[PDB]
Nucleic acid binder design. Structure first.
Ligand SMILES: [Zn+2]
Ligand SMILES: [Zn+2]
Lengths: 1461, 107, 57, 83
RNA sequence: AUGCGA
């Protein structure tokens, strides 16, 4: 790029469409006929693949333009294919149309009038008149030609009327109508159309029997024979191989006779070009020749290998020449040669040659369509991971970029980057020279490329470049006096020379660290060249936004070359604009490790400083010469202690820095925060957790991660809120210097003394650890369910424990219970020891300090060093056990010791026994596995929906529209609030303690002249009236929309969410007594301030909220009874699967519903399988029929009556009706595989024999139900079956009670809400009958599809937002509801559950966005077949064409006002 | 409104569209057992007039096909009787804004 | 497959394992582990087993 | 497409993105010898110059706010509340 | 493509 070379012919859209052989021949620079590639062992063969007409080569000029290899753009040749062949990309299409035709008439086998009806629907759908397209079906009246013509007349009349109306109404235009829904209705229509087209298994217009068409797969079609009934039926109505040529000759005529419908069938929009639809589009009569420029050989270091295109194309030319040789045989034979069957072999040449050439064209297109590492064709070249689109279009290498290992440095600003002088001398900006920069650039040139702010090159306005790489100080001196020369050519008089100056201390640079996981990981930093560096230098405050660490991390440094990219990298992407994440709005940028412990130490009431020390620390952290102040002098406080000696506190130092960094025109920040250090640690009466800031003065407490690093209201967050990001950044740099210097004066250390306990602490630790010896077996006998103190060597205990070992679930219970108990021993140990039993406490103990302040470490780590490691776990449970029953060789089988399960009593300070080192090694490895796999499950989660929402942005009307224009939400989260603003928007009391400061920021008198302060406030009064009048959800007085619906919230102060308005008023009422303690502020001036804060906190027009959403759901999902975590998020977002893995339906139970009634209902709904009641099945097979006496010995009548609430009569009905019928059917299926006794009981047995062909006897325990015996007799011819196995299978397939789709209803403990029952299945219709126990209005479910089918689109939407909210809530992640709510609205944009994969992408309107995700060639094919036009709205698509992205700064245009006189 | 007891035959379903003189709506007597508009997750759906629709389409300068969609066989569309083209205003309570007004076009 | 099993005690090292894709795939033998490189005396073992009470197959 | 001046309905405030583009394009103009309408006051960075020009609203640029319909609103710098 | 650094 050069700003000196504008263009004004930008591409506005991209049309797709098939070529034509006449077009190729006319444009073609040459016909290539010679399969030769090179000649004279070293020359480009004439009229071959390397003819100079195809571009420049080997110093041979392009024979078509005469341009060198460095100048010729190249020109495309063409091949005259012998035959016609088949276009692979449309082979699936043309095959369908072959199957759709009639071979005796050459019409479509669908009724002609029905076809015309289809043309009508597709015409109305070019203009997108959907309502009229469906209204067409109603036009209705042996069918006369006058009547079928009357249907064509009436339908054409409806098209003409609906069009005339829509063009009159401007509801469409001559250019068509195109939207996501129109595209979807078209794909649906064309699909049903293709189904009707395929449905006719004989023609209709002509009644003829077309042959069945078969295909080889990619090179041959055959024409099946017909039946003499159908052939003679054709006469009364009076497999074969075919060439591509015959298909072409048929399809030309068929495609011409059906042109009238196909005109709209082959266009999704009006074919303004009146283009005939020709069959020659699916076949290749000719083949092009790419430019030689793109056919250069593969030279790898030294080896020169021919290009694979040359190879496949040469194979087409050779095979084609062989077929040309057969045509030589036609010139050869075909005089007559009446009986020379000699051509029977040449006929093998025709079939083999023809299929061969066709296959070879396929192979050149797609390797997977030919017949060991076959050179790739263009289909392989474009797709998969690469997809030329993905590896060189959606992402590229870039110039003016460097990569280097990052090194820390606290002395630079928190917004700067230390550039090593290798980069400072090797990175340039193209600076146009003016009258104002002539001095600086003349000096930079004088320095030359081999200095500091010199300059490597000079680009004239004439376009030529002059490199300074090797010019002498004399020559550069000479050029310095020519940087300002006059004009010379009217062609160049408007330009000025350019100087490629080295990167310097006034340029902004875009730093990126791989993880890109979020936009906050790639910020703009102000360049600071550091001498004698070799590594990119970065401030610590940024490392929690990049997730970077000096361990060896490498960073990419991008240097933008344009004032637009400079201004954006200094104003939009800059670090200060990234102090909060959009995920949650918690600060991601704060001090770290040592700075935290230094702040904890400096801010202790115990830290005093002499005037000398105090002032030294102050100038150490504040340089007025560096612009570090708003005073241009220094100011200081009175000492804390006037007495014996003048003494300042550390809190007085924080007061001095805050007093010196804030603007003198503003009162000091007032904040009540808290620490991460309980007051108890500073003494029995000390009070040090309340952080108190009064008018800029820290009056109580210390500071830690919670304060200036926690990014949660703490001090730094409060300064960010009150004075803005520039002040908060200044505060961060000042703190970083203050704490680094104080760590120079006093330092910080940690050692073995910081790790020891007392003799007392070891006494308690060992004494508590003596109690786990009972715990191990005590839990083993609890899970085993055996009496207390049961001997550790009881044989029954060992057998029961082997039963447990062989069962994975029982073993899970044993692990979980032993775990809970030994974890209770851990909790005891730590709670006893730790803070009380350490050999040195608090401050005196750095190890405790780092965890408790949260500089580094946790109380878990501190307890792992000082107390015990505790229970190791794997995949959620205790140590694996060998099949011998041993968890380690040294452990006897089934050892009930806690340690043998993996409980490590040893600690890092005194070591771990080797048996324990093998378990901590187990947990540590499986940790490294989880750590190494989580990143592969989060990339696809990011990209899969990042592709979709990238088009999704804020319209200028505050509505969320996609880059298409399709509206997604009418407001962002329904409030239009920016997450990066909201954090204090609901912290009224804080704003009040800082009222005058915020009044000084958002002073309204400047703005009260540009907007309205009443209209919205008045609507707020009437609506607040109606809202207090209706303060039941769906029998309220709907009449007043919210104020956000009726007035642009950015224009009439007061248009605010009713939730925020309500909270604000409720605050003003609940603090009227605080409003009776103020100097004089009032709820009308304060309420006015909070409304103005709300207007000034709104999301900007053009915000990239789609991408921000996608990153705010992806990025935090890397830290990650029902499916949880990434598989659950994939199950929703990625697949929108209508088959959840664990579908559940929650049932609220009425307040009146007893717990016992609830357990009865839980039994009453759960399914009961017949297997579940069977105790024993005895089959006595006797075989002179084959006798099977099947004896089912059940449980006791009361046993199954108390587990499943079923009777013996229900067992009678199920056995006598279901079980037997299914088993008897299974026995018949097995044959196919082969090839007392009372009168009422006697009548039952005889009747069941009468219902079932195989059964003979039936004896039932009518006295309880304990068994069901029936005799089955089969003929010898029955051979052999495994009757026991058949019975088992039918047992698990017979149900006493099943509600369709519902498995089990469980009674979980109520928590944080109404009593409910959670079912493991989803069936709303069935719970509708249970209304007398379940408030149906309060049923909820995890199954999105089932909700959509039953409760509709809004219920599925709310279910999505709830389910995702639950997934993140499980990991205690904060995620703004605005993100999830946007994502849900995007998944429901069509009224359904439209997942984010390729299937859902199909319905989007941007064809390039489809191309650039997956199945690139499939989306390409569907696009070309549509004759689609790209309106170039997709950001990806727009990137493909090198166009200013439409998001953000490209959401609008800039023009200039110029004087006319 | 035609409430069948178990089923209506597809031949009668060809009668359902057969009198452009008056819409015919078929309803399952088992599916009427509960008013889905009773449910806690289903916000208030309000049918918009032809003039309130024309006004909405004017304030936002957009086509009908560019609004968010509601399916013609959506249960709630079947409750309100939404014809094709009909816009419904959905007043939903949001976890952050309180009352929030959204819209959907029935297509 | 990557799960560290207790069978490996004394044979594969519980800590000599790479970090990344190979984790759990690239084990390391213990410093005291040996590999048989021959086979021996299988011919005399039947005689002693038969003497010890093994019934001939 | 012309939204009448009497009818402009958009945010009276300059978005951060609007401010960014204005300052970048105008700075680039000053760096290509667009006539500076304010005292250079010593400065050599064209971007800081464009920032000064914004501070005095002397910038002669107009923002064309697009609406997804295609209608747009021509707004002067001299009216859009800079911050 | 293998191993590997972050
Ligand atoms: Zn050329
Ligand atoms: Zn026909």
């Amino acid at each position: 790029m050069d700003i000196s070379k504008p263009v004004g012919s930008e591409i506005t859209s991209v049309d797709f469409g098939i070529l034509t052989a006449k077009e190729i021949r006319n444009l073609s620079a040459k016909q290539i006929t010679n399969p030769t590639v090179l000649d004279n062992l070293g020359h480009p063969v004439s009229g071959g693949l390397y003819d100079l007409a195809l571009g420049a080569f080997l110093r041979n000029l392009c024979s078509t333009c005469g341009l060198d290899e460095k100048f010729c753009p190249g020109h495309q040749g063409h091949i005259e294919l012998p035959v016609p062949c088949y276009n692979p990309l449309f082979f699936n299409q043309l095959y369908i149309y072959l199957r759709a035709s009639c071979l005796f008439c050459h019409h479509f086998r669908l009724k002609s009038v029905e076809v015309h009806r289809y043309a009508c629907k597709l015409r109305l759908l070019q203009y997108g008149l959907i309502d009229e397209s469906y209204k067409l079906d109603e036009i209705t009246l042996d069918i006369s030609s006058t009547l079928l013509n009357e249907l064509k007349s009436k339908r054409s009349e409806y098209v003409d009327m609906a069009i005339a109306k829509a063009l009159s109404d401007g509801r469409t235009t001559e250019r068509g109508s195109f939207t996501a829904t129109v595209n979807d209705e078209r794909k649906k229509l064309v699909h049903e159309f293709h189904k009707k087209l395929l449905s006719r298994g004989k023609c209709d217009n002509c009644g003829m029997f077309s042959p069945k068409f078969r295909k080889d797969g990619f090179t041959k079609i055959f024409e099946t024979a017909l039946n003499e009934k159908q052939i003679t039926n054709n006469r009364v109505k009076g497999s074969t191989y075919i060439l591509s040529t015959e298909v072409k000759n048929i399809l030309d005529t068929v495609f011409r006779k059906e042109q009238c419908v196909l005109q709209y069938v082959f266009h999704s929009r009006p074919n303004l070009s009146r283009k005939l639809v020709k069959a020659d589009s699916f076949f290749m009569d000719v083949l092009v020749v790419p430019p030689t420029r793109f056919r250069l050989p593969s030279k790898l270091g030294e080896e020169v290998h021919e290009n694979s295109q040359n190879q496949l194309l040469s194979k087409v030319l050779t095979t084609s020449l062989l077929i040309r040789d057969l045509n030589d045989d036609l010139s050869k034979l075909q005089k007559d040669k009446v009986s020379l069957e000699d051509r029977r072999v040449i006929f093998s040449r025709l079939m083999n040659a023809f299929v061969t050439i066709q296959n070879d064209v396929n192979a050149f297109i797609d390797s997977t369509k030919a017949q060991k590492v076959p050179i790739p064709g263009v289909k392989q070249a474009l797709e998969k991971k690469e997809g030329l689109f993905r590896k060189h279009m959606m992402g590229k290498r870039v110039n003016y970029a460097a990569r280097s290992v990052i090194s820390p440095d606290p002395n630079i600003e928190t917004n700067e980057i230390g550039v090593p002088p290798v980069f400072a001398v090797k990175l340039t900006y193209p600076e146009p020279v003016t009258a104002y920069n002539i001095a600086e650039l003349r000096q930079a040139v004088i320095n030359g490329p081999d200095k500091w702010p010199g300059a490597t090159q000079i680009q004239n306005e004439d376009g030529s470049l002059v490199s300074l790489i090797g010019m002498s100080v004399e020559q550069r001196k000479a050029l310095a006096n020519q940087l300002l020369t006059p004009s010379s050519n009217v062609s160049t008089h408007t330009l000025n020379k350019k100087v490629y100056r080295h990167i310097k201390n006034r340029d902004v640079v875009l730093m990126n660290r791989q993880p890109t996981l979020h936009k906050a990981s790639m910020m703009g930093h102000k360049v600071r060249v550091l001498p004698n560096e070799k590594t990119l230098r970065l401030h610590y405050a940024n490392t929690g936004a990049y997730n970077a660490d000096f361990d060896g991390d490498e960073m990419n440094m991008h240097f933008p070359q344009n004032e637009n990219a400079r201004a954006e990298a200094l104003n939009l992407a800059n670090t200060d604009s990234q102090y909060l994440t959009p995920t949650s709005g918690s600060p991601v940028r704060g001090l770290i490790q040592d700075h935290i412990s230094a702040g904890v130490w400096l801010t202790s009431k115990d830290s005093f400083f002499t005037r000398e020390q105090y002032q030294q620390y102050i100038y150490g952290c504040i340089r007025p010469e560096d612009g570090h102040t708003t005073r241009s002098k220094i100011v200081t406080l009175p000492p804390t202690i006037f007495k014996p000696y003048p003494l300042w506190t550390g809190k007085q130092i924080i007061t001095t820095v805050l007093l010196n960094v804030t603007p003198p025109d503003m009162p000091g920040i007032n904040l009540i925060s808290k620490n991460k250090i309980k007051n108890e640690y500073w003494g029995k009466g000390s009070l040090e957790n309340e952080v108190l800031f009064k008018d800029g003065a820290l009056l109580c407490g210390i500071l830690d991660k919670s304060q200036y690093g926690a990014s949660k209201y703490g001090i730094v967050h409060s300064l960010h809120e009150v004075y803005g990001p520039e002040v908060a950044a200044k505060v961060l740099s000042v703190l970083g210097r203050l704490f680094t210097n104080y760590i120079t004066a006093t330092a910080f250390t940690c050692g073995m003394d910081d790790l020891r306990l007392t003799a007392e602490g070891n006494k308690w630790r060992t004494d508590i650890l003596k109690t786990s010896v009972d715990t191990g077996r005590e839990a083993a006998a609890e899970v085993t369910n055996l009496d207390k103190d049961t001997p550790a060597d009881d044989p029954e205990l060992l057998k029961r424990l082997q039963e447990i070992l062989r069962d994975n679930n029982k073993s899970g219970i044993l692990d979980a219970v032993t775990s809970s108990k030994v974890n209770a021993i851990t909790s005891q140990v730590v709670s006893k020891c730790v803070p009380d039993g350490t050999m040195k406490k608090f401050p005196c103990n750095s190890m405790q300090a780092m965890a408790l302040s949260g500089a580094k470490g946790s109380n878990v780590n501190v307890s792992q060093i000082m107390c015990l490691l505790g229970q190791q776990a794997l995949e959620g449970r205790r140590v694996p056990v060998m099949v011998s029953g041993k968890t380690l060789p040294s452990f006897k089988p089934y050892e009930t010791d806690a340690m043998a399960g993996g409980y490590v009593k040893g600690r890092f300070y005194s070591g771990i026994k080797p048996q324990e080192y093998y378990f901590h090694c187990m947990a540590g490895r499986e940790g490294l596995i989880d750590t190494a796999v989580k990143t592969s499950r989060s990339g696809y989660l990011q990209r899969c929906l990042t592709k979709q929402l990238e088009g999704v942005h804020v319209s200028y009307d505050n509505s969320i529209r996609d880059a298409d224009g399709t509206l997604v939400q009418f407001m962002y989260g329904g409030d239009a609030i920016d997450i990066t603003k909201e954090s204090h928007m609901t912290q009224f009391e804080f704003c009040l303690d800082n009222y005058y400061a915020l009044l000084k920021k958002y002073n309204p008198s400047a703005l009260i002249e540009h907007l309205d302060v009443e209209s919205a406030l008045k609507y707020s009064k009437k609506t607040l009236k109606y809202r207090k009048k209706h303060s039941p959800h769906y029998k309220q007085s709907v009449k007043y929309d919210p104020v956000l619906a009726k007035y642009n919230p950015a224009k009439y102060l007061g248009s605010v969410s009713e939730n925020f308005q309500d909270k604000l008023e409720s605050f003003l009422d609940k603090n009227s007594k605080l409003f009776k303690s103020s100097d004089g502020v009032n709820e009308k001036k304060f309420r006015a301030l909070m409304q103005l804060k709300y207007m000034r906190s709104l999301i900007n027009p053009g915000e990239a909220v789609g991408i921000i959403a996608s990153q705010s759901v992806g990025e935090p999902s890397t830290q990650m009874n029902v499916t949880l975590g990434i598989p659950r998020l994939r199950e929703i977002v990625m697949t929108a699967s209508a088959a959840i893995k664990t579908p559940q339906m929650t049932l609220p139970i009425w307040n009146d519903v007893s717990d016992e009634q609830a357990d009865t209902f839980c039994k009453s709904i759960s399914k009961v399988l017949l297997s579940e009641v069977i105790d024993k099945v005895i089959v006595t097979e006797t075989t002179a029929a084959r006798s099977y006496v099947i004896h089912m010995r059940f449980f006791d009548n009361n046993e199954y009556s108390e587990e499943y609430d079923v009777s013996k009569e229900e067992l009678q009905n199920v056995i006598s009706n279901q079980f037997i019928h299914l088993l008897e059917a299974a026995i018949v299926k097995e044959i196919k595989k082969q090839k007392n006794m009372n009168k009422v009981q006697r009548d039952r047995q005889s009747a069941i024999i009468s219902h079932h062909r195989f059964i003979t006897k039936y004896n039932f325990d009518d006295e309880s139900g304990k068994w069901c015996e029936f005799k089955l007799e089969l003929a010898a011819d029955t051979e052999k079956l495994l009757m026991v196995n058949i019975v088992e299978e039918i047992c698990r397939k017979s149900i006493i009670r099943q509600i369709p789709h519902i498995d089990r209803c469980v009674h979980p403990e109520p928590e944080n809400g109404k009593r409910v029952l959670v079912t493991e299945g989803v069936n709303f219709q069935a719970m509708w009958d249970q209304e007398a126990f379940i408030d149906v209005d309060g049923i909820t479910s995890n199954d999105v599809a089932a909700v959509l089918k039953t409760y509709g689109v809004e219920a599925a939407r709310n279910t999505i937002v709830n389910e995702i909210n639950n997934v993140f809530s499980r990991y205690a992640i904060s995620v703004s509801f605005r993100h999830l709510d946007l994502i849900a609205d995007m998944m429901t944009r069509q009224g359904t559950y439209l997942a984010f994969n390729r299937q859902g992408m199909e319905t989007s309107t941007s064809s390039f966005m489809k191309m650039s995700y997956e199945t690139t060639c499939q989306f390409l094919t569907k696009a070309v077949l549509d004759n689609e036009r790209e309106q170039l709205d997709s950001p990806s698509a727009r990137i493909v064409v090198g166009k200013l992205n439409n998001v953000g700064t490209g959401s609008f245009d800039v023009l200039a006002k110029v004087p006319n006189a | 409104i035609f409430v069948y007891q178990n089923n209506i035959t597809p031949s009668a379903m060809k009668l359902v569209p057969s009198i452009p003189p008056a819409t015919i709506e078929t309803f399952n007597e088992a599916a009427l057992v509960v008013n889905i508009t009773h449910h806690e997750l289903v916000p208030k759906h309000i049918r918009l007039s032809s003039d309130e629709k024309r006004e909405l389409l004017k304030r936002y300068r957009l086509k009908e096909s560019q609004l968010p969609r509601i399916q013609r066989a959506d249960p709630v569309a079947l409750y309100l009787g939404l014809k094709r083209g009909e816009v419904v205003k959905i007043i939903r309570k949001s976890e952050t804004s309180g009352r929030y007004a959204s819209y959907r076009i029935c297509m | 497959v990557r799960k560290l099993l207790p069978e490996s005690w004394g044979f594969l090292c519980p800590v000599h394992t790479p970090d990344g894709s190979p984790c759990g795939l690239l084990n390391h033998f213990a410093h005291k582990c040996r590999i048989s490189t021959q086979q021996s005396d299988v011919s005399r073992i039947p005689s002693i087993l038969y003497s010890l009470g093994v019934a001939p197959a | 497409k012309a939204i009448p001046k009497d009818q402009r309905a958009t945010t009276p405030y300059m978005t951060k993105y609007e401010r960014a583009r204005i300052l970048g394009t105008r700075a680039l103009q000053i760096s290509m010898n667009a006539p500076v309408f304010v005292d250079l006051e010593g400065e050599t960075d064209p971007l800081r110059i464009a920032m000064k020009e914004l501070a005095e609203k002397k910038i002669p640029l107009v923002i064309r706010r697009y609406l997804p319909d295609g209608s747009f609103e021509d707004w002067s710098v001299e009216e859009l509340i800079v911050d």
